Amino acid sequence: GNPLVYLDVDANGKPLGRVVLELKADVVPKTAENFRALCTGEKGFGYKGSTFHRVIPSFMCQAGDFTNHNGTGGKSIYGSRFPDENFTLKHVGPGVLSMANAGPNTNGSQFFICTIKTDWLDGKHVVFGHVIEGMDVVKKIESFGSKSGRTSKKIVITDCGQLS
Numbered sequence: 001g002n003p004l005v006y007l008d009v010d011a012n013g014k015p016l017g018r019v020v021l022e023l024k025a026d027v028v029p030k031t032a033e034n035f036r037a038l039c040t041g042e043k044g045f046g047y048k049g050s051t052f053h054r055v056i057p058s059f060m061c062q063a064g065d066f067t068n069h070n071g072t073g074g075k076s077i078y079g080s081r082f083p084d085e086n087f088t089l090k091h092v093g094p095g096v097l098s099m100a101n102a103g104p105n106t107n108g109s110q111f112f113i114c115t116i117k118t119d120w121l122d123g124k125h126v127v128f129g130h131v132i133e134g135m136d137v138v139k140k141i142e143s144f145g146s147k148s149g150r151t152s153k154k155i156v157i158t159d160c161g162q163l164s
């Protein structure tokens with residue numbers, strides 16, 4: 001079946017817990033595979049040690065820039081950027097996992113977890129999974145955001161990997 005992966009997240013050096021994500025490889029296999037491999041670190045790089053750098057309350061929590069840690073960087077397992085696979089899955093509510101980008105066909109490693117329905121991103125960002133477990137952790141992360149996206153705590157993915 002679809003991969004299950006995890007992110008263990010600290011805030012200011014203390015653990016918040018685990019976010020478990022289902023990756024919809026059935027619908028977006030290339031996008032799911034990128035995220036899966038970045039969680040395991042098996043290509044020699046990935047999310048371990050990187051941050052949630054942009055968090056906006058009542059919107060989303062964004063992470064995955066493991067090169068620049070500021071939202072300008074990141075890279076995929078295929079190359080620096082890769083195409084929008086499809087827009088079949090929609091931003092239907094809290095818990096949606098979707099690719100951050102800088103316009104059409106600029107997927108790398110940055111991603112976000114929605115804390116509300118973000119329907120205006122449909123057809124613009126590739127949704128590729130959702131939160132199976134740990135929405136409590138996501139709500140904690142969300143609470144350390146601001147309107148500008150600047151976080152009020154240092155939010156770090158201390159560990160990550162694949163469960164199945």
Ligand SMILES: Nc1ccc2cn[nH]c2c1
Binds near residue numbers: 072106107
């Ligand atoms: N892949 C990717 C995702 C978000 C942003 C923002 N600037 N550059 C990016 C590149």
